[PDB]
Amino acid sequence: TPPQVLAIGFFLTIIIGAVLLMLPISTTKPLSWIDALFTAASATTVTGLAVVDTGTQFTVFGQTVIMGLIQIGGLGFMTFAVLIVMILAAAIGLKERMLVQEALNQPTIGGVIGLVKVLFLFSISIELIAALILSIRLVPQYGWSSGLFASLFHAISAFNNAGFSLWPDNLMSYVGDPTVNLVITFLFITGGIGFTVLFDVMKQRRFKTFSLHTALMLTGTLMLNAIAMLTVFILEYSNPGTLGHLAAVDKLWASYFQAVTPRTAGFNSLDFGSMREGTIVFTLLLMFIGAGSASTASGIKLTTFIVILTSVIAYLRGKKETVIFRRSIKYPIIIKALAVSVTSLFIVFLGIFALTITEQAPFLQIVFETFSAFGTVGLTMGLTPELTTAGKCIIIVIMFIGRIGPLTFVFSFAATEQSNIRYPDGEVFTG
């Protein structure tokens, strides 16, 4: 069924792939049974964590199989299951049309087969032209054996919001590189915004004719980034460790990128293990709230935040209803928003709790790791490599649960119950 399928199905691409890389061909140094079912699950979830380094540990075989897993979930689990029935066969009833309506967040089922072609085709479209053309501009340095691949490997990870970098220095080497900061940011940003805002702006193209949702994203997306670059720049300005000593121009490529990478991007322009405690904080929240619905990965999509927050902002005033852009928000959207909200938190809390005891590590890093793990953010304060075994199995579940969304995930093993009889009023205070 629609939910379960995406639950146990997406679960297999991780297992099968956890052996596609644990193979003696893609692994130079011995890949422990633990650090194999992990790194293979981080790429498929487009999370940005890994027990073992990337560009090194893995050969050309362990770096190619990672781009295939970072693509599978980069559009959803059912975004690739309906694309193998039209290019090889054709025609699909209302039986499979209800599956992609759950893998791209769609309120309609009567029409999700025909789009299947466009999505993936459009995927490898902006992934190639922006990688092998614009990303191979300043990367041909390492030659053609490492300049051709390294420029294509990061796009399938940049646009998909993955965080899997080739060289050990997760992009940290390109601190103020104009091409990098400009090329890759455009990849995970748009790739990050819901497929709606992606498709919307296309045929709509009007400065006004943008639906509530679509119109929302653009505003919140950009707007927020402004508060993000301002935060990182004000706190990590004097920080001698990172950005603090960079020039005048190089300080913007760090604040900007670092204020845009927490969006489940997974790239490091600097190092989070050497930044003011305050900065790291704002991030936990900035990485908690993903970016976009249909997006390409996230724990709690931006939209959810806006709603929940703004909706509350209305209560403190009086508006009997939560109205946005003079186009009121129906009641349902509220309860679901709340649900998805408390869920992410309730879980992330279960992790930060089940890890502080599992491994003797700092507290700030134990919390930063959890939020990032559930939101497939990629940024790690340097605890991913030193993750014990006990804390791995559970952590593998975090990224698993986070990427799969707390809602569409809970609907699987949830015996839907239908109440037909109402009950008496229940008074209760909470002020």
């Binding site: 109440s419 037909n420 009889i421 109402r422 009950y423 008496p424 009023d425």
Partner: protein
């Protein structure tokens, strides 16, 4: 000895019919004649008159009657003014049929020697019949009757699965029953989901819309409900409900009159 009933409604008619049966003089009398006609051989004296007019009360030697019964429903003022005039003729014991709560109060300050709530007072009696009849109790339709049973049974200390169509009533009866539920007795899934099958005694007190009263009992009989008691409205309701399988039918207005006709008889 001297008996006279004013207002030949369903209640006032069930008293002139019962008292005459026992063998007691009954000065039946209603406003119009439509009823007074059918009760020409059901009472010692059938009279057509209006209880609000003085000369009509006097000319009828109503003063010789120690027991006056004002059963005129609807127009409360008719019920009141009458009892009011009655209390002026120094009528020994005036028994009146009140409609709502306030009718009780006002009629009480006038001098009403007794007030009866056909729907209310009956429910308590039934709530006594269901208790001495044996565990699982459930009353559908929280009308005046169905409400006087969930209130009485809960009083005695018996589980009562109260339930009405809307919530307006179900709310005021949240602490008047073991379980207050808002539902429609015509829907199957609602009857099932409420584990209504475990109830040996189901009470359909939903007034008005007879079909609601019927269909329900109809559904109830399908779940093999041991003993289903239903509140019938008119004569035909009795018949139809009888062919459905109704284990018991009650006429609040009718059945009450006979009881009162027994209270007035043993009262002298």
């Amino acid at each position: 000895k001297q008996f006279a009933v004013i207002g030949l409604g369903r209640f006032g008619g069930s008293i002139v019919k019962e008292l005459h049966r026992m063998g007691h003089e009954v000065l039946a009398v209603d406003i119009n004649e439509e009823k007074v006609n059918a009760y020409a051989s059901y009472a010692t004296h059938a009279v057509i008159a209006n209880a609000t007019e003085e000369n009509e009360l006097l000319s009828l030697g109503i003063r010789n009657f120690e027991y006056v019964i004002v059963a005129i429903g609807a127009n409360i003022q008719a019920s009141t003014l009458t009892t009011l005039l009655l209390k002026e003729l120094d009528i020994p014991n005036i028994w009146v049929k009140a409609q709502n709560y306030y009718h009780h109060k006002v009629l009480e300050k006038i001098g009403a020697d007794r007030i009866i709530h056909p729907e209310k007072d009956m429910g308590v009696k039934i709530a006594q019949s269901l208790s001495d009849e044996n565990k699982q109790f459930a009353v559908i339709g929280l009308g005046r009757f169905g409400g006087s049973i969930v209130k009485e049974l809960h009083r005695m200390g018996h589980e009562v699965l109260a339930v009405d169509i809307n919530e307006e009533k179900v709310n005021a009866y949240a602490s008047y029953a073991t379980h207050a539920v808002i539902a429609n007795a015509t829907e199957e899934n609602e009857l099932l989901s409420l584990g209504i099958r475990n109830f040996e005694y189901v009470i359909v007190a939903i007034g008005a819309n007879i079909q609601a009263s019927t269909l329900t009992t109809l559904l109830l009989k399908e779940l093999d409900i041991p003993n289903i008691w239903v509140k019938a409205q008119n004569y035909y309701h009795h018949k139809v409900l009888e062919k459905i399988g109704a284990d018991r039918i009650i006429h609040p207005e009718k059945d009450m009159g006979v009881k009162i006709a027994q209270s007035l008889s043993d009262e002298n």
